[PDB]
Design an enzyme around this catalytic site. Structure first.
Site, PDB file in Angstrom:
ATOM      1  CG  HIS A   8      -2.415  -0.418   0.310  1.00 27.79           C
ATOM      2  ND1 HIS A   8      -3.315   0.551  -0.125  1.00 27.79           N
ATOM      3  CD2 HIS A   8      -2.808  -1.626  -0.162  1.00 27.79           C
ATOM      4  CE1 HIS A   8      -4.238  -0.104  -0.811  1.00 27.79           C
ATOM      5  NE2 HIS A   8      -3.950  -1.397  -0.914  1.00 27.79           N
TER       6      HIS A   8
ATOM      7  CD  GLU B 234     -11.519   8.847   9.628  1.00 31.46           C
ATOM      8  OE1 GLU B 234     -10.858   7.850   9.997  1.00 31.46           O
ATOM      9  OE2 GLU B 234     -11.734   9.124   8.422  1.00 31.46           O
TER      10      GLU B 234
ATOM     11  CG  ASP C 182      -9.780   5.814   7.383  1.00 27.07           C
ATOM     12  OD1 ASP C 182     -10.217   5.874   8.547  1.00 27.07           O
ATOM     13  OD2 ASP C 182      -9.392   6.817   6.744  1.00 27.07           O
TER      14      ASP C 182
HETATM   15  C1  LIG Z   1      -3.404   1.977   0.143  1.00 28.09           C
HETATM   16  C2  LIG Z   1      -4.033   2.481   1.423  1.00 28.09           C
HETATM   17  C3  LIG Z   1      -3.205   2.868   2.475  1.00 28.09           C
HETATM   18  C4  LIG Z   1      -3.725   3.374   3.665  1.00 28.09           C
HETATM   19  C5  LIG Z   1      -5.122   3.487   3.815  1.00 28.09           C
HETATM   20  C6  LIG Z   1      -5.958   3.103   2.755  1.00 28.09           C
HETATM   21  C7  LIG Z   1      -5.438   2.594   1.569  1.00 28.09           C
HETATM   22  C8  LIG Z   1      -6.382   2.209   0.451  1.00 28.09           C
HETATM   23  N1  LIG Z   1      -5.702   3.962   4.992  1.00 28.09           N
HETATM   24  C9  LIG Z   1      -4.903   4.290   5.980  1.00 28.09           C
HETATM   25  C10 LIG Z   1      -5.499   4.804   7.211  1.00 28.09           C
HETATM   26  O1  LIG Z   1      -6.677   5.081   7.358  1.00 28.09           O
HETATM   27  N2  LIG Z   1      -4.588   5.067   8.224  1.00 28.09           N
HETATM   28  C11 LIG Z   1      -3.195   4.911   8.131  1.00 28.09           C
HETATM   29  O2  LIG Z   1      -2.481   5.192   9.101  1.00 28.09           O
HETATM   30  N3  LIG Z   1      -2.652   4.468   6.954  1.00 28.09           N
HETATM   31  C12 LIG Z   1      -3.457   4.195   5.930  1.00 28.09           C
HETATM   32  N4  LIG Z   1      -2.904   3.780   4.750  1.00 28.09           N
HETATM   33  C13 LIG Z   1      -1.436   3.839   4.584  1.00 28.09           C
HETATM   34  C14 LIG Z   1      -0.798   2.548   5.099  1.00 28.09           C
HETATM   35  O3  LIG Z   1      -0.720   2.579   6.529  1.00 28.09           O
HETATM   36  C15 LIG Z   1       0.612   2.460   4.513  1.00 28.09           C
HETATM   37  O4  LIG Z   1       0.559   2.234   3.101  1.00 28.09           O
HETATM   38  C16 LIG Z   1       1.527   1.432   5.185  1.00 28.09           C
HETATM   39  O5  LIG Z   1       2.744   1.366   4.448  1.00 28.09           O
HETATM   40  C17 LIG Z   1       0.910   0.063   5.375  1.00 28.09           C
HETATM   41  O6  LIG Z   1       0.647  -0.612   4.136  1.00 28.09           O
HETATM   42  P1  LIG Z   1       1.282  -2.095   3.951  1.00 28.09           P
HETATM   43  O7  LIG Z   1       1.012  -3.008   5.080  1.00 28.09           O
HETATM   44  O8  LIG Z   1       0.785  -2.529   2.579  1.00 28.09           O
HETATM   45  O9  LIG Z   1       2.861  -2.106   3.958  1.00 28.09           O
HETATM   46  P2  LIG Z   1       3.935  -1.793   2.784  1.00 28.09           P
HETATM   47  O10 LIG Z   1       3.370  -0.684   1.968  1.00 28.09           O
HETATM   48  O11 LIG Z   1       4.251  -3.065   2.017  1.00 28.09           O
HETATM   49  O12 LIG Z   1       5.301  -1.368   3.501  1.00 28.09           O
HETATM   50  C18 LIG Z   1       5.362  -0.102   4.212  1.00 28.09           C
HETATM   51  C19 LIG Z   1       6.754   0.121   4.766  1.00 28.09           C
HETATM   52  O13 LIG Z   1       6.952  -0.717   5.935  1.00 28.09           O
HETATM   53  C20 LIG Z   1       7.927  -1.707   5.667  1.00 28.09           C
HETATM   54  N5  LIG Z   1       7.438  -2.963   6.221  1.00 28.09           N
HETATM   55  C21 LIG Z   1       6.447  -3.779   5.737  1.00 28.09           C
HETATM   56  N6  LIG Z   1       6.176  -4.803   6.511  1.00 28.09           N
HETATM   57  C22 LIG Z   1       7.056  -4.656   7.574  1.00 28.09           C
HETATM   58  C23 LIG Z   1       7.293  -5.435   8.725  1.00 28.09           C
HETATM   59  N7  LIG Z   1       6.649  -6.572   8.999  1.00 28.09           N
HETATM   60  N8  LIG Z   1       8.241  -5.004   9.589  1.00 28.09           N
HETATM   61  C24 LIG Z   1       8.909  -3.877   9.312  1.00 28.09           C
HETATM   62  N9  LIG Z   1       8.787  -3.073   8.247  1.00 28.09           N
HETATM   63  C25 LIG Z   1       7.837  -3.524   7.410  1.00 28.09           C
HETATM   64  C26 LIG Z   1       8.157  -1.704   4.151  1.00 28.09           C
HETATM   65  O14 LIG Z   1       9.432  -2.210   3.770  1.00 28.09           O
HETATM   66  C27 LIG Z   1       7.906  -0.229   3.823  1.00 28.09           C
HETATM   67  O15 LIG Z   1       9.046   0.570   4.108  1.00 28.09           O
HETATM   68  O1  LIG Z   2      -6.913   6.170   2.860  1.00 29.07           O
HETATM   69  C1  LIG Z   2      -7.458   6.552   3.891  1.00 29.07           C
HETATM   70  N1  LIG Z   2      -6.756   7.104   4.974  1.00 29.07           N
HETATM   71  C2  LIG Z   2      -5.373   7.358   5.076  1.00 29.07           C
HETATM   72  C3  LIG Z   2      -4.472   7.075   4.037  1.00 29.07           C
HETATM   73  C4  LIG Z   2      -3.108   7.412   4.206  1.00 29.07           C
HETATM   74  C5  LIG Z   2      -2.692   8.030   5.416  1.00 29.07           C
HETATM   75  C6  LIG Z   2      -3.601   8.367   6.424  1.00 29.07           C
HETATM   76  C7  LIG Z   2      -4.974   8.061   6.242  1.00 29.07           C
HETATM   77  N2  LIG Z   2      -8.877   6.428   4.101  1.00 29.07           N
HETATM   78  C8  LIG Z   2      -9.834   6.142   3.158  1.00 29.07           C
HETATM   79  C9  LIG Z   2     -11.137   6.546   3.416  1.00 29.07           C
HETATM   80  C10 LIG Z   2     -12.105   6.370   2.411  1.00 29.07           C
HETATM   81  N3  LIG Z   2     -11.769   5.940   1.193  1.00 29.07           N
HETATM   82  C11 LIG Z   2     -10.534   5.600   0.900  1.00 29.07           C
HETATM   83 CL1  LIG Z   2     -10.076   4.987  -0.656  1.00 29.07          CL
HETATM   84  C12 LIG Z   2      -9.522   5.730   1.827  1.00 29.07           C
END
Ligand SMILES: *Cc1cc2c(cc1C)nc1c(=O)[nH]c(=O)nc-1n2C[C@H](O)[C@H](O)[C@H](O)COP(=O)(O)OP(=O)(O)OC[C@H]1O[C@@H](n2cnc3c(N)ncnc32)[C@H](O)[C@@H]1O
Ligand SMILES: O=C(Nc1ccccc1)Nc1ccnc(Cl)c1
Length: 467
Positions: A63, A248, A133
């Site tokens: 993500h 929110e 979220d």
């Molecule tokens: C795409 C998205 C992201 C998102 C969201 C909604 C969507 C559709 N809503 C969020 C929300 O309401 N609140 C919030 O705080 N974040 C929200 N996001 C963002 C999301 O937290 C980030 O994208 C985050 O990176 C988590 O996503 P994901 O689990 O897919 O992890 P990644 O993108 O592959 O890696 C992120 C970084 O962390 C390192 N990593 C990954 N796994 C680990 C472990 N197990 N240990 C240590 N480091 C780790 C990766 O290498 C990278 O640097």
């Molecule tokens: O991405 C979100 N939150 C977020 C993402 C990155 C950082 C902090 C919050 N929230 C969310 C809410 C409704 N529709 C969609 Cl696609 C996404």
């Protein structure tokens, strides 16, 4: 390698070389499929002992927006891939502690929050207290950032609701850590952007989950009244008193309109008091009369609302597109100046112009541990302002215009001295990282890197240290 598998399969390489942002495309040499923590330790250890130390990065659900989970010419650890029948039966049951005054659960670092939720509800009707979220994110991925949603004002972010971790350091050493055990690594890793190790276990705090949610949206045209209302709502609940369970908000594409979004959690025991509690809370608000939209639904359906939107977007070919997101933490003292300069200035009132949702809501800094690596504004109440932009597919000009709009917002904050901080930072340049962290926090961050990942093997996609 141990029990794990080192894959060079074309489809695995392709998934590991892309993310939700849909722009960054650094390719790994291989994708590692671990069976257990020792396998991740063995792989990282081998990277640390090799002559030309290859990059190792963990991937959750992918993500990231700008290649944070990518390992150019190295190895991507697919943490979120299911590990088979034996792994599913071996997942830990929630455990009660008389010392903590509640339950916790140990989860694999790659577990998706949606799977953590289904597991804890099925084993005692328990659930995490603090969410994102979107539930199809990994525990390790969110804990490396903060993990925020409408509950963070009261429970703090997800990094404030974890008791302990197992971390595979940049040296391939498995280290158990918490506030009372190796605290420098524990607090370093929480919000640490994967810089100090890979989380292979996390011990998540749990509460007795509600059954249902009264989900409310109300409209505002007056920003001063909209923010005064969000700030009043996040100040409630000190000592477990009457409050909404989620707060929110978002900017509405219409003057400019704002939408306040709140929920009230309930079960069979509290169903009799919901309506009176909601009415009392709403009666104290200043929203536009007759603009209250209410829905009543199960707790799990409310938590998964963004996944329901995803399925609808996928079916229209609107999910897998570039996402030039910008997420800011804005001091409450400058939020009115931000609305004037950005929602009314940069965006000119039409947003619309943003290319997707624009979330806006305040949080309480005292719910964030000052020892963690997370970077927040130098003020008690600060807002998340989330520009959740989608670019039109096959339209390069759409991505260019949204990236320019991001730059203008950042230049406006720097120029008017707003003191905003990026959440999920994509700085990449050295002096900007120094300014992001500040003198005291940068020094601490560099010292942790020298101790835990001196070869800069881990999470090189974040672009902080030279690998
Ligand atoms: C795409 C998205 C992201 C998102 C969201 C909604 C969507 C559709 N809503 C969020 C929300 O309401 N609140 C919030 O705080 N974040 C929200 N996001 C963002 C999301 O937290 C980030 O994208 C985050 O990176 C988590 O996503 P994901 O689990 O897919 O992890 P990644 O993108 O592959 O890696 C992120 C970084 O962390 C390192 N990593 C990954 N796994 C680990 C472990 N197990 N240990 C240590 N480091 C780790 C990766 O290498 C990278 O640097
Ligand atoms: O991405 C979100 N939150 C977020 C993402 C990155 C950082 C902090 C919050 N929230 C969310 C809410 C409704 N529709 C969609 Cl696609 C996404």
């Amino acid at each position: 390698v141990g029990g794990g598998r080192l894959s060079v399969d074309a489809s695995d390489i392709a998934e590991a070389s892309r993310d939700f942002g849909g722009v960054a495309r650094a390719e790994p040499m291989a994708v590692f499929h671990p069976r257990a923590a020792g396998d991740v330790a063995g792989l990282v250890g081998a990277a640390f002992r090799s002559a030309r130390g290859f990059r190792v990065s963990a991937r959750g659900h992918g993500h990231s927006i700008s290649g944070q989970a990518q390992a150019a010419g190295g190895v991507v650890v697919d943490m979120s891939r299911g590990r088979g029948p034996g792994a599913a039966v071996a997942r830990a049951l929630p455990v009660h502690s008389a010392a903590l005054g509640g339950h916790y659960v140990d989860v694999w670092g790659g577990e998706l929050w949606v799977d953590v939720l289904n597991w804890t509800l099925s084993h005692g009707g328990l659930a995490p207290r603090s969410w994102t979220d979107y539930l199809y994110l990994s525990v390790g991925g969110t804990l490396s950032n903060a993990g925020i949603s409408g509950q963070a004002f009261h429970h703090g972010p997800q990094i404030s609701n974890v008791y302990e971790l197992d971390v595979v350091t940049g040296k391939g050493e498995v280290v158990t850590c918490s506030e009372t055990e190796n605290p420098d690594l524990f607090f370093g890793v929480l919000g640490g952007l994967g810089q100090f190790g890979i989380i292979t276990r996390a011990r998540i705090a749990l509460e007795r989950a509600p059954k249902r949610v009264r989900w409310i949206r109300a409209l505002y045209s007056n920003f001063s009244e909209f923010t005064a209302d969000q700030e009043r709502l996040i100040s409630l609940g000190s000592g477990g008193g009457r409050r909404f369970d989620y707060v929110e908000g978002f900017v509405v594409a219409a003057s400019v309109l704002y939408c306040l979004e709140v929920t009230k959690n309930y079960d069979d025991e509290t169903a009799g008091s919901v309506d009176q509690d909601v009415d009392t809370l709403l009666g104290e608000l200043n929203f536009l009369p007759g603009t209250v939209f209410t829905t009543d639904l199960p707790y799990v359906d409310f938590l998964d609302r963004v996944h329901k939107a995803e399925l609808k977007l996928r079916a229209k070919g609107m999910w897998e597109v570039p996402h030039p997101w910008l997420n800011l933490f804005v001091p409450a003292s400058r939020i009115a100046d931000f609305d004037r300069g950005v929602f009314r200035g940069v965006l000119g009132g039409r947003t619309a112009g943003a290319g997707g949702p624009v979330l806006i809501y305040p949080m309480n800094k005292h719910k964030w541990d000052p020892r963690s690596s997370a970077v927040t504004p130098d003020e008690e109440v600060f807002y998340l302002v989330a520009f959740l932009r989608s670019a039109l597919p096959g339209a390069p000009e759409s991505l260019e215009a949204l990236a320019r709009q991001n730059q203008r917002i950042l230049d406006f904050c720097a120029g008017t001295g707003i003191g905003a901080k990026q959440y999920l930072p994509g700085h990449k340049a050295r002096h900007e990282w120094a300014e992001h962290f500040g003198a005291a926090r940068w020094d601490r961050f560099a010292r942790l890197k020298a101790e835990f990942d001196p070869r800069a093997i881990l999470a090189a996609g974040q672009g902080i240290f030279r690998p």
